[PDB]
Design a protein around this motif. Structure first.
Motif, PDB file in Angstrom:
ATOM      1  N   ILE A  16       0.744  -1.137  -0.194  1.00  0.00           N
ATOM      2  CA  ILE A  16       0.041  -0.105   0.173  1.00  0.00           C
ATOM      3  C   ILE A  16       0.865   1.377   0.150  1.00  0.00           C
ATOM      4  N   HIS A  17       0.182   2.374  -0.443  1.00  0.00           N
ATOM      5  CA  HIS A  17       1.087   3.795  -0.526  1.00  0.00           C
ATOM      6  C   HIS A  17       0.171   4.773  -0.269  1.00  0.00           C
ATOM      7  N   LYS A  18       0.360   5.891   0.439  1.00  0.00           N
ATOM      8  CA  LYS A  18      -0.452   6.959   0.499  1.00  0.00           C
ATOM      9  C   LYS A  18      -0.351   7.909  -0.573  1.00  0.00           C
ATOM     10  N   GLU A  19      -1.144   8.463  -1.459  1.00  0.00           N
ATOM     11  CA  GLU A  19      -1.224   9.200  -2.533  1.00  0.00           C
ATOM     12  C   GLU A  19      -1.931  10.424  -2.126  1.00  0.00           C
ATOM     13  N   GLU A  20      -2.067  11.627  -2.646  1.00  0.00           N
ATOM     14  CA  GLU A  20      -2.872  12.764  -2.335  1.00  0.00           C
ATOM     15  C   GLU A  20      -4.306  12.468  -2.080  1.00  0.00           C
ATOM     16  N   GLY A  21      -4.950  11.597  -3.222  1.00  0.00           N
ATOM     17  CA  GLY A  21      -6.053  11.527  -3.060  1.00  0.00           C
ATOM     18  C   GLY A  21      -6.849  10.506  -2.158  1.00  0.00           C
ATOM     19  N   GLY A  22      -5.697   9.630  -1.447  1.00  0.00           N
ATOM     20  CA  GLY A  22      -6.037   8.624  -0.561  1.00  0.00           C
ATOM     21  C   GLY A  22      -4.967   7.385  -0.745  1.00  0.00           C
ATOM     22  N   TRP A  23      -5.224   6.381   0.165  1.00  0.00           N
ATOM     23  CA  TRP A  23      -4.215   5.239  -0.168  1.00  0.00           C
ATOM     24  C   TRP A  23      -4.653   4.495  -1.483  1.00  0.00           C
ATOM     25  N   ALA A  24      -3.725   3.979  -2.032  1.00  0.00           N
ATOM     26  CA  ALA A  24      -3.555   3.071  -3.150  1.00  0.00           C
ATOM     27  C   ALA A  24      -3.148   1.645  -2.449  1.00  0.00           C
ATOM     28  N   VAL A  25      -3.475   0.700  -3.189  1.00  0.00           N
ATOM     29  CA  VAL A  25      -3.112  -0.624  -3.167  1.00  0.00           C
ATOM     30  C   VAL A  25      -2.570  -1.039  -4.542  1.00  0.00           C
ATOM     31  N   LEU A  26      -1.007  -1.549  -4.113  1.00  0.00           N
ATOM     32  CA  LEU A  26      -0.194  -1.697  -5.230  1.00  0.00           C
ATOM     33  C   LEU A  26      -0.011  -3.009  -5.407  1.00  0.00           C
ATOM     34  N   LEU A  27      -0.114  -3.619  -6.844  1.00  0.00           N
ATOM     35  CA  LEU A  27       0.196  -5.030  -7.066  1.00  0.00           C
ATOM     36  C   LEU A  27       1.532  -4.976  -8.022  1.00  0.00           C
ATOM     37  N   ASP A  28       2.461  -5.517  -7.661  1.00  0.00           N
ATOM     38  CA  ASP A  28       3.882  -5.486  -8.128  1.00  0.00           C
ATOM     39  C   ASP A  28       4.065  -3.860  -8.488  1.00  0.00           C
ATOM     40  N   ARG A  30       2.235  -1.245  -8.867  1.00  0.00           N
ATOM     41  CA  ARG A  30       1.257  -0.682  -9.721  1.00  0.00           C
ATOM     42  C   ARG A  30       0.039  -0.264  -8.995  1.00  0.00           C
ATOM     43  N   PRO A  31      -0.510   0.738  -8.855  1.00  0.00           N
ATOM     44  CA  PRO A  31      -1.747   0.973  -8.034  1.00  0.00           C
ATOM     45  C   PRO A  31      -3.110   0.250  -8.796  1.00  0.00           C
ATOM     46  N   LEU A  32      -3.758  -0.541  -7.991  1.00  0.00           N
ATOM     47  CA  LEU A  32      -5.047  -1.159  -8.423  1.00  0.00           C
ATOM     48  C   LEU A  32      -5.874   0.052  -8.974  1.00  0.00           C
ATOM     49  N   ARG A  33      -6.761  -0.357  -9.798  1.00  0.00           N
ATOM     50  CA  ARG A  33      -7.863   0.747 -10.582  1.00  0.00           C
ATOM     51  C   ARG A  33      -9.371  -0.175 -10.318  1.00  0.00           C
ATOM     52  N   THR A  34     -10.236   0.492 -10.249  1.00  0.00           N
ATOM     53  CA  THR A  34     -11.481  -0.092 -10.551  1.00  0.00           C
ATOM     54  C   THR A  34     -11.770  -0.887 -11.633  1.00  0.00           C
ATOM     55  N   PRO A  35     -12.774  -1.663 -11.901  1.00  0.00           N
ATOM     56  CA  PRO A  35     -13.233  -2.234 -13.007  1.00  0.00           C
ATOM     57  C   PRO A  35     -13.433  -1.363 -14.184  1.00  0.00           C
ATOM     58  N   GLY A  36     -13.761  -0.119 -14.064  1.00  0.00           N
ATOM     59  CA  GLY A  36     -14.182   0.947 -15.017  1.00  0.00           C
ATOM     60  C   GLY A  36     -12.851   1.758 -15.083  1.00  0.00           C
ATOM     61  N   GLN A  38     -10.982   3.597 -13.137  1.00  0.00           N
ATOM     62  CA  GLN A  38     -10.839   4.804 -12.073  1.00  0.00           C
ATOM     63  C   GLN A  38      -9.975   4.430 -11.219  1.00  0.00           C
ATOM     64  N   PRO A  39      -8.925   5.576 -10.643  1.00  0.00           N
ATOM     65  CA  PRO A  39      -8.217   5.470  -9.705  1.00  0.00           C
ATOM     66  C   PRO A  39      -8.938   4.678  -8.498  1.00  0.00           C
ATOM     67  N   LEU A  40      -8.299   3.748  -7.793  1.00  0.00           N
ATOM     68  CA  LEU A  40      -8.718   3.183  -6.452  1.00  0.00           C
ATOM     69  C   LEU A  40      -8.121   3.977  -5.504  1.00  0.00           C
ATOM     70  N   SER A  72     -17.044  -3.298  -2.151  1.00  0.00           N
ATOM     71  CA  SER A  72     -17.474  -2.125  -1.669  1.00  0.00           C
ATOM     72  C   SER A  72     -16.817  -1.056  -2.088  1.00  0.00           C
ATOM     73  N   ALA A  73     -15.554  -1.005  -1.994  1.00  0.00           N
ATOM     74  CA  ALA A  73     -14.521   0.185  -2.402  1.00  0.00           C
ATOM     75  C   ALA A  73     -14.914   0.722  -4.206  1.00  0.00           C
ATOM     76  N   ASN A  74     -15.058  -0.430  -4.907  1.00  0.00           N
ATOM     77  CA  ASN A  74     -15.459  -0.275  -6.349  1.00  0.00           C
ATOM     78  C   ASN A  74     -16.680   0.715  -6.214  1.00  0.00           C
ATOM     79  N   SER A  75     -17.663   0.326  -5.641  1.00  0.00           N
ATOM     80  CA  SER A  75     -19.096   0.803  -5.554  1.00  0.00           C
ATOM     81  C   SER A  75     -18.953   2.307  -5.065  1.00  0.00           C
ATOM     82  N   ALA A  76     -18.098   2.375  -4.129  1.00  0.00           N
ATOM     83  CA  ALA A  76     -17.962   3.851  -3.333  1.00  0.00           C
ATOM     84  C   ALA A  76     -17.424   4.654  -4.547  1.00  0.00           C
ATOM     85  N   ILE A  77     -16.305   4.333  -5.158  1.00  0.00           N
ATOM     86  CA  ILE A  77     -15.525   5.052  -6.232  1.00  0.00           C
ATOM     87  C   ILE A  77     -16.483   5.305  -7.315  1.00  0.00           C
ATOM     88  N   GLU A  78     -17.084   4.150  -7.797  1.00  0.00           N
ATOM     89  CA  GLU A  78     -17.980   4.420  -9.083  1.00  0.00           C
ATOM     90  C   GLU A  78     -19.240   4.810  -9.120  1.00  0.00           C
TER      91      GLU A  78
END
Length: 236
Positions: A16-28, A30-36, A38-40, A72-78
């Motif tokens: 994980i890593h904190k960005e200006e817009g919130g915490w990101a979850v990193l896969l190798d 790289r920040p995870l995105r939503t299915p659409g 959008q930045p997670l 739930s996070a995907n729904s929150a964001i999208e």
């Protein structure tokens, strides 16, 4: 033929890593995105760590039932954050259509069972939230006080977007704003809210026997409510 291949665990590491817009979850890295796509971005370290655990736990193929927090996070964001005002009004409007207001008018024993379980929750909302709901029986209509409807609207609109996301199913699945608010405000837990919401069906089942289909639905609705409650707590 390759759909599962595309859904494989193609990453080695999760962090994980904190960005200006919130915490990101990193896969190798790289920040995870939503299915659409959008930045997670997440509001808390606790939620980021718990979502990272979901992605670390993936074995050969992504399993969404094992990833309820990501869902739930995907729904929150999208869905919920971009539609916050609408979603807040819709959930607040359950104050005028609340399970706890619409009592049976018969049999007597059911009237009493509903009062035993639900009157404490009506009283809680009346004192904690200054939102006394009116109750009725059977088909007799009763409108709510416009000021009480206002107060309940304002309570919902005061939530942050991930909190509103968590509230959603705690309201819609039992059909009660009061039960949903009582969970997020710490008056009851989700298993208690679920049980309270089922007083009619359990009265009928004790009289006429259990319906396994209905019981299966109720159990699936309990786990869903537990998932929403977990998302609430992790986003504080």
């Amino acid at each position: 033929h390759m759909s599962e291949w595309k859904a494989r665990r193609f990453w080695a590491s999760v962090g994980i890593h904190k960005e200006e817009g919130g915490w990101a979850v990193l896969l190798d890295e790289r920040p995870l995105r939503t299915p659409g796509k959008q930045p997670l971005r997440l509001p808390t370290e606790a939620l980021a760590l718990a979502i990272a655990e979901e992605w670390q736990a993936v074995q050969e193929v992504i399993d969404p039932n094992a990833m309820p927090l990501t869902r739930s996070a995907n729904s929150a964001i999208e869905k919920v954050a971009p539609q916050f005002d609408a979603v807040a009004a819709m959930l607040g409007d359950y104050g005028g259509t609340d399970l706890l207001s619409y009592r049976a008018d018969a049999p007597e024993a059911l009237v009493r069972a509903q009062a035993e379980g639900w009157d404490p929750l009506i009283d809680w909302a009346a004192t904690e939230l200054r939102a006394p709901l009116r109750i009725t029986h059977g088909v007799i209509p009763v409108p709510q006080d416009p000021v009480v409807l206002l107060k309940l609207r304002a309570e919902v609109a005061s939530l942050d977007p991930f909190g509103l996301t968590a509230l959603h199913d705690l309201v819609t699945l039992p059909g009660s704003l009061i039960l949903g608010l009582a969970v997020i405000r710490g008056r009851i837990d989700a298993p208690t809210a679920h049980a309270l919401s089922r007083i009619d069906e359990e009265f009928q089942a004790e009289r006429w026997g259990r319906d396994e289909e209905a019981e299966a639905q109720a159990a699936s609705r309990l786990a869903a409510m537990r998932d929403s409650e977990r998302f609430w707590h992790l986003t504080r």
